[PDB]
Amino acid sequence: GETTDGVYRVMTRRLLGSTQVGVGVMQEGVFHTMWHVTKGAALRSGEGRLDPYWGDVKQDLVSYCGPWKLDAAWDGLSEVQLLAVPPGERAKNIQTLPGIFKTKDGDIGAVALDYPAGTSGSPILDKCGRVIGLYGNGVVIKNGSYVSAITQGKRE
Amino acid sequence: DMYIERAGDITWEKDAEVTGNSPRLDVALDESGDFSLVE
Numbered sequence: 068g069e070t071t072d073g074v075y076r077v078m079t080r081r082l083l084g085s086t087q088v089g090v091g092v093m094q095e096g097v098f099h100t101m102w103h104v105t106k107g108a109a110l111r112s113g114e115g116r117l118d119p120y121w122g123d124v125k126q127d128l129v130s131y132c133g134p135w136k137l138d139a140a141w142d143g144l145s146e147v148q149l150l151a152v153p154p155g156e157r158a159k160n161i162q163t164l165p166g167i168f169k170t171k172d173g174d175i176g177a178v179a180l181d182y183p184a185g186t187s188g189s190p191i192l193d194k195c196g197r198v199i200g201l202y203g204n205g206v207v208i209k210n211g212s213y214v215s216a217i218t219q220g221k222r223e
Numbered sequence: 224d225m226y227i228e229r230a231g232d233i234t235w236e237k238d239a240e241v242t243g244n245s246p247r248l249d250v251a252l253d254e255s256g257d258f259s260l261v262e
């Protein structure tokens with residue numbers, strides 16, 4: 068299978084035509100996505116098989132072929148880019164200043180950009196192109212719009 | 224049965240479309256990993 072670092076679409080044929088269910092990041096031979104995209108299922112990369120390695124429904128994260136590799140953090144100050152990979156449409160960088168999810172367990176970056184649910188797992192980047200977390204788990208607001216956490220895993 | 228396709232390099236691109244606001248929201252995270260607005 069293709070193991071080149073970068074961003075990938077996650078597709079299924081179990082529905083009408085070929086449907087994009089989400090997005091992920093290949094880094095150091097590990098594929099990183101959100102749990103709600105795959106539900107922990109194995110993946111194909113050509114004729115190669117990717118098996119889940121680590122997963123947590125509460126973090127809504129999952130890794131294939133090895134442990135979670137991405138440990139960059141939003142600095143709490145600078146603008147970021149959502150590298151959106153919408154269904155049918157080319158990768159596009161969107162630059163934004165994240166808001167803040169306030170929780171009992173601490174504050175998290177949040178990005179307020181509308182994209183379809185099939186965009187879930189697209190990476191959020193810092194100015195050095197490091198992945199500071201993934202887009203696709205968040206909350207619906209008074210407007211009707213969506214606000215995603217900047218979801219980041221832990222590296223060991 | 225799910226498969227992946229490459230869609231680009233992961234790169235900061237100078238002069239990308241700048242958009243979106245920066246809202247400060249009170250939220251709760253449940254055991255199913257679903258966020259909700261606390262009010």
Ligand SMILES: Cc1cnccc1NC(=O)c1cc(C2CC2)n(C)c1C
Nearest residue numbers: 103182183184186187203204213215
């Ligand atoms: C399906 C699911 C299950 N569990 C947790 C979160 C989700 N995510 C969504 O429900 C979702 C994600 C987006 C876009 C930002 C990507 N939109 C608009 C929606 C409604």
